[PDB]
Amino acid sequence: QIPASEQETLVRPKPELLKLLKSVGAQKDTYTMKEVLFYLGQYIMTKRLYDEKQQHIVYCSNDLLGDLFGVPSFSVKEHRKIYTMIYRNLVVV
Numbered sequence: 264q265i266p267a268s269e270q271e272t273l274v275r276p277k278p279e280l281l282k283l284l285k286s287v288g289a290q291k292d293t294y295t296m297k298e299v300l301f302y303l304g305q306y307i308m309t310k311r312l313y314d315e316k317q318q319h320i321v322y323c324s325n326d327l328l329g330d331l332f333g334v335p336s337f338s339v340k341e342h343r344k345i346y347t348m349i350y351r352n353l354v355v356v
């Protein structure tokens with residue numbers, strides 16, 4: 264969906280995103296957009312933030328993810344919206 268070169272962007276997470284990344288096994292200061300996404304996805308799976316019936320819907324209010332994204336819920340299919348929500352929380356290198 265999102266172009267591969269955008270997927271390959273080297274990025275440095277701001278402290279709060281780094282913190283969520285590191286609670287799901289992350290061990291570095293510098294990441295590609297791809298690695299950020301994997302780890303955020305692992306967070307969502309571990310914490311079971313998805314709707315049982317419609318599993319592409321995520322609920323993230325009163326949660327670190329909520330703090331980062333600025334929305335209470337979203338569909339995981341709207342990639343451009345997710346990328347926009349991610350970009351707020353990092354520095355492109």
Ligand SMILES: Cc1cccc(-c2nc(C(=O)O)c(-c3cccc(Cl)c3)n2-c2cc(Cl)ccc2C)c1
Nearest residue numbers: 300301303304307308313318319339341342345346
């Ligand atoms: C319910 C749940 C748990 C874990 C991952 C996902 C899930 N399913 C898909 C998908 O595309 O089908 C995606 C996805 C993949 C590539 C880019 C973007 Cl922006 C999102 N994700 C996904 C969603 C978020 Cl918010 C963060 C990371 C991933 C990997 C959904």
